[PDB]
Ligand binder design. Structure first.
Ligand SMILES: [Mg+2]
Ligand SMILES: [Mg+2]
Ligand SMILES: [Mg+2]
Ligand SMILES: [Mg+2]
Ligand SMILES: [Mg+2]
Ligand SMILES: [Mg+2]
Ligand SMILES: [Mg+2]
Ligand SMILES: [Mg+2]
Ligand SMILES: [Mg+2]
Ligand SMILES: [Mg+2]
Ligand SMILES: [Mg+2]
Ligand SMILES: [Mg+2]
Ligand SMILES: [Mg+2]
Ligand SMILES: [Mg+2]
Ligand SMILES: [Mg+2]
Ligand SMILES: [Mg+2]
Ligand SMILES: [Mg+2]
Ligand SMILES: [Mg+2]
Ligand SMILES: [Mg+2]
Ligand SMILES: [Zn+2]
Lengths: 97, 25, 63, 91, 226, 127, 50
RNA sequence: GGUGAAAUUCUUGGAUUUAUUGAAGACUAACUACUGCGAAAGCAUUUGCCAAGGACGUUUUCAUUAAUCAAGAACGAAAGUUAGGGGAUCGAAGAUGAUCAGAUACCGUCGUAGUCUUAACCAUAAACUAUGCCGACUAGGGAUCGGGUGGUGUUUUUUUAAUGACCCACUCGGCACCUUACGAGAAAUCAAAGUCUUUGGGUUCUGGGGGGAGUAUGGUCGCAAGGCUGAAACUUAAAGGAAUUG
């Protein structure tokens, strides 16, 4: 039967959405169906921050961040514990944790 | 068996039958 | 032959598949105010003194 | 009435030379024997004299064109980019 | 990995840093600082004449370190070497650009990104391709959560951005353009012209790239480095 | 007071490259990879290999005369992963602790404006 | 289809070239009958890397 | 270099990597959303040109010109076909390196056709919302897109106008969404799948247990691949749908 009212994607009024590639396996997946996350992270991984702050030529340094928009297919998103299988009731939960 | 490959197999069969009938015709 | 003594101040938890490895956070005895995270094989408490054969390393997990 | 179904002008070739070659010469012979609009006198009087020579019966002008059409697409786009570069050389 | 080389050579010793010399690189006069580092080439032998090998070098340096302050920390300046006179070789402007972290922090969603670019020639015969970026912003008191533009506002904004860029670069030389780009007056002129179209935050001018330089004109280059 | 090179850490998977160049980037100093210090393709990309590479490039640039570095961290990019490998922060922290001076960390991973095509096919890398 | 007095390819109880039809550039007149100084031969698949 | 691990492969002729350029073709990232347009397939750089279209507004005009439609006609992803161009990537086939008992599969490295374009064809798809179109009525709730109306509302200009961007209230037309079940349904679920034994608003198409079988044959279209139309013999008591506990 029909599992999801949205068919597992976000396509109401298009007919076609150009696909992207999974960042883990290069599977072609429509852009609306993917499991888009946003990895915003400091570059120093929070353990060398003191060493770089004391080894910097400048005080007051910003220590910038790296930003990536990660696109996952369903299989890789499930296998990498990004999303997991939810109950039939809490499948409808739309809000992020 | 899967319906797509059943369709492919009977299409190859139809092609082979076409050629063995065109042998006489 | 340099080795670095480090006093464990906080035990985190067991690691590895079979639980025979413990994450610890050690504070260096000399050159204090320096903290690092290591893996320990045997039974460890806090306030123990480890002898790191090399200090320039930090572990994450053991799958 | 319609005498032939699909061979058209290539009915003069009969059964010879193959259908896939007769199709190409059909598509090209229609073009080289068609009449075209004269860009000077405005009439449908341009006819091919020889390969590349297209002359108007009314105004007696003679244009150099394609071998089977009065103007090829390559010549059209070359005229367009030449016009654009001429418009660009002042600006 | 250290021993897996099956053959080192298809067929079958001196340190090269004793062979090299240092060289101090100078920025043009449109900067409060000049000494932006040092560079290395081999010794100027009779067959190489190391000045020519060192001529075509492009060195990137941050505008914060060029201007002392830290508010220019997200802008980079490429300086192309053009002349060498005795160990304190002088450079010239080759292109501005932002950093990836700044651009990535600027671009967020539920707002509209507006880019424009012009390919315009300046007074002293340089051909510069200037890029400008802008972002829609929520007004104060706005309760709807995206604040997108309506794609004709975008076209008008891009038109006025392009004509302002051409007007500000024409009649200006290259050094005049750098002394315009440093204090960021183009951004305030753009927001002054576009405030009657959209609120329109983040009016940064992105990279500018040289496409065609005129001939060298060492007098005009030495007019900077005094 | 400080003399600067640039660091140019390309920390991919399967390897990590650390090599200091001049501010112009034309003169190369101390190219050491992760696989030049270990005996396995596995630990070519290990954080230990990265810090050893950072250690001996630090020694070489210190005996050359370079005191500080401008750091350019780089993933594979293009159509590929665009995320930094495991050896990036290791090499960075190692050449920070070695005694070099740091300034102006930035990322130079090549990101495409609508790249050609990722490898693997539309069904992906099936394993 | 000629006789061996007329062409290098002539003769034989079957119509066949015999030796390779690719001829050296340093060949002489009377020998250059075939593909002169062919860098490659056969059907041209893919782009020629022009 | 690659992988779970490797190997094939490239490397003192300098590989990998760094910098400066240059060429080629492809693509249009991030912005990008339970957002928009389009009859559908589909469509994401800028600018210019060409014609088109919906909604809204209207105290403009015609006057029933309309709805659905056998036949018939236009368009119709990808793949494929013909002939030129282009041919950077990726890559059916193929070749190799692994794995495996085997592995002409999955993984790795090359790599042809193709992938792009022009002129023609082909007429299919899980071409899906698996839900025909037109029309009326029937529960609440808020949000959003486009247009419009009003508000001494906020901000900007030239403090101040008009704009524009917001805010509030309303309205028309959309893509949808949330909650309930008066109702419906075999249930899953549905504001349509409701107003259907209290069975009739108009109309088109399709199905009659499962296989055999979308097969054979005969037509017709197509260069071909194939498409459309389309049985029977024989065989069988079950196949099948939605949910329940294991
Ligand atoms: Mg299921
Ligand atoms: Mg579709
Ligand atoms: Mg004879
Ligand atoms: Mg002879
Ligand atoms: Mg012979
Ligand atoms: Mg004979
Ligand atoms: Mg090299
Ligand atoms: Mg884009
Ligand atoms: Mg839109
Ligand atoms: Mg194969
Ligand atoms: Mg069908
Ligand atoms: Mg259907
Ligand atoms: Mg209705
Ligand atoms: Mg409205
Ligand atoms: Mg509405
Ligand atoms: Mg809509
Ligand atoms: Mg029945
Ligand atoms: Mg039946
Ligand atoms: Mg079931
Ligand atoms: Zn005429």
């Amino acid at each position: 039967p029909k599992k999801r009212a949205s068919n597992g994607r976000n396509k109401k009024g298009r007919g076609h959405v150009k696909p992207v590639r999974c960042v883990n396996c290069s599977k072609s997946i429509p852009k609306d169906k993917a499991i888009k996350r946003m990895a915003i992270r400091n570059i120093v991984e929070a353990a060398a921050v003191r060493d770089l702050s004391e080894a910097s030529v400048y005080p007051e340094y910003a220590l910038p961040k790296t930003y990536n928009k990660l696109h996952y297919c369903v299989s890789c998103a499930i296998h990498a514990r990004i999303v997991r299988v939810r109950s039939r009731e809490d499948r409808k939960n739309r809000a992020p944790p | 068996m899967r319906a797509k490959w059943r369709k492919k197999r009977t299409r190859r069969l139809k092609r082979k039958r076409r050629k063995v009938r065109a042998r006489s015709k | 032959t340099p080795v670095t003594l480090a006093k464990v101040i906080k035990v985190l938890g067991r690691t590895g598949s079979r639980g025979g490895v413990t994450q610890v956070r050690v504070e260096f005895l000399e050159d204090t105010s320096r903290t690092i995270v290591r893996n320990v094989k045997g039974p460890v408490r806090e306030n123990d003194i480890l002898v790191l054969m090399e200090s320039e390393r930090e572990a994450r997990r053991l799958r | 009435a319609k005498r032939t179904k699909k061979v058209g002008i290539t009915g003069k070739y009969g059964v010879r030379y193959g259908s896939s070659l007769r199709r190409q010469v059909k598509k090209l012979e229609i073009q080289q024997h068609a009449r075209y609009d004269c860009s000077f006198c405005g009439k449908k009087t341009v006819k091919r004299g020889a390969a590349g020579i297209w002359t108007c019966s009314c105004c007696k002008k003679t244009v150099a064109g394609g071998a089977y059409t009065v103007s090829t697409a390559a010549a059209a786009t070359v005229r367009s980019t030449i016009r654009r570069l001429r418009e660009m050389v002042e600006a | 990995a250290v021993g897996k080389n099956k053959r080192l050579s298809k067929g079958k010793v001196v340190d090269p840093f004793t062979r090299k010399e240092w060289f101090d690189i100078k920025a043009p006069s449109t900067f409060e600082n000049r000494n932006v580092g040092k560079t290395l080439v081999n010794k100027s032998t009779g067959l190489k004449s190391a000045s020519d090998a060192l001529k075509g070098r492009v060195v990137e340096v941050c505008l914060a370190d060029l201007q002392g302050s830290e508010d220019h920390s997200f802008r980079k300046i490429k300086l192309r070497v053009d002349e060498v006179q005795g160990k304190n070789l002088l450079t010239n402007f080759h292109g501005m650009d932002f950093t990836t972290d700044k651009l990535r922090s600027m671009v967020r969603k539920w707002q509209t990104l507006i880019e424009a670019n012009v390919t315009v020639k300046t007074s002293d015969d340089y051909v510069l391709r200037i890029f400008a970026i802008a972002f829609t912003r929520k007004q104060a008191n706005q309760v709807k959560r995206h604040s997108y533009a309506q794609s004709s506002h975008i076209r008008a904004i891009r038109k006025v951005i392009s004509e302002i860029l051409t007007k500000e670069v024409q009649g200006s030389t290259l050094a005049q353009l750098t002394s315009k780009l440093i204090p960021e007056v183009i951004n305030k002129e753009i927001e002054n012209a576009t405030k009657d179209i959209f609120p329109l935050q983040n009016i940064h001018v992105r990279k500018v790239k040289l496409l065609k330089q005129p001939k060298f004109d060492v007098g005009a280059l030495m007019a900077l480095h005094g | 007071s400080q003399v600067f090179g640039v660091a140019r850490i390309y920390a991919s998977f399967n390897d990590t490259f650390v090599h200091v160049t001049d501010l112009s980037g034309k003169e190369t100093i101390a190219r050491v990879t992760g696989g030049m210090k270990v005996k396995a393709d596995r630990d070519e990309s290990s954080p230990y290999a990265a810090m050893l590479a950072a250690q001996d490039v630090a020694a070489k640039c210190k005996e050359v005369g370079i005191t500080a570095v401008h750091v350019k961290i780089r993933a594979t990019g293009g159509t590929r992963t665009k995320t930094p490998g495991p050896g990036g922060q290791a090499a960075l922290r190692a050449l920070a602790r070695s005694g070099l001076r740091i300034g102006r960390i930035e990322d130079v991973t090549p990101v495409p404006s609508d790249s050609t095509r990722k490898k693997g096919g539309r069904r992906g890398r099936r394993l | 289809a000629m006789n061996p007095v007329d062409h290098p390819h002539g003769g034989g109880n079957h119509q066949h070239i015999g030796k390779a039809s690719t001829i050296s550039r340093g060949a002489v007149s009377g020998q250059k009958a075939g593909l002169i100084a062919a860098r490659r031969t056969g059907l041209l698949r893919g782009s020629q890397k022009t």
